[PDB]
Design a protein around this ligand. Sequence first.
Ligand SMILES: CN(C)c1ncc(Cl)c(Nc2ccc3c(c2)CC(=O)N3)n1
Ligand SMILES: CN(C)c1ncc(Cl)c(Nc2ccc3c(c2)CC(=O)N3)n1
Ligand SMILES: [Cl-]
Ligand SMILES: [Cl-]
Lengths: 4, 4, 123, 123
Amino acid sequence: WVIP
Amino acid sequence: WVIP
Amino acid sequence: DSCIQFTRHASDVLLNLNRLRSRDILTDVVIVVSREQFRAHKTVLMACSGLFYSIFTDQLKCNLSVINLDPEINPEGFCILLDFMYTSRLNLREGNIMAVMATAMYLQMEHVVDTCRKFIKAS
Amino acid sequence: DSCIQFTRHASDVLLNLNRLRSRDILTDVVIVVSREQFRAHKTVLMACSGLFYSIFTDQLKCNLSVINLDPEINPEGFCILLDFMYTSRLNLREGNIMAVMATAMYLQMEHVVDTCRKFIKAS
Ligand SMILES: CN(C)c1ncc(Cl)c(Nc2ccc3c(c2)CC(=O)N3)n1
Ligand SMILES: CN(C)c1ncc(Cl)c(Nc2ccc3c(c2)CC(=O)N3)n1
Ligand SMILES: [Cl-]
Ligand SMILES: [Cl-]
């Protein structure tokens, strides 16, 4: 999971 | 396009 | 093999599937959550959820145009998860995290359940 | 928004859609290319091809279970492109590149046409  |  | 690969292809496919959903094109099922109704593509639901995969591989349920979820399921939690299925983006907030995790456990969306558990553990 | 994103989601969705294709689950159309028949999902075909997008948004053609392609289309070129739609992988070889480019131009798959033009220019 990432900060888009 | 890339070499997978 | 000796294939070449187009990096953005999967993302572009999913973006177009979401465009079809937003315009209600070739949607073949309605998911009923309490009073709320959500139109979707059976194949996308199966590709994202262990629960929908089981439902639509069943020889009788594969032909249903309406699926009613357990009354304990929160429509907002379902809406956030349906949006994730079609975009890869999860709107996870302090006020919705418990309903999102419970809905993801019911829908059998393992990666969502994992990030909810981690975010709850941190707080 | 304040969303989080799952990097592998789009790729995982496409992998599952290809698993459904391989098992012939919820396929809703057969594409006829000369004597050869190819089963597929209308939504995936639309998401990948400008030609299929135009066909299946048409109020009459959206309901057809069989689509016949122009007799000039080569079944091998179509097979390579259908595989690309469901995997992001293109089996481009010296012996098939002309048939692949011609099929991609007909199907309106701009990124495939672009890589074929570049590979031909190099040789
Ligand atoms: C497991 N399998 C062969 C398969 N093939 C095709 C599809 Cl559409 C599919 N989808 C599915 C099944 C289980 C789970 C998911 C999708 C997401 C998840 O967390 N569990 N699973
Ligand atoms: C253009 N548009 C709004 C849109 N929405 C939904 C879908 Cl499924 C779609 N697909 C499509 C259209 C044109 C082209 C492609 C897909 C691939 C391409 O090279 N051209 N295009
Ligand atoms: Cl997931
Ligand atoms: Cl393309």
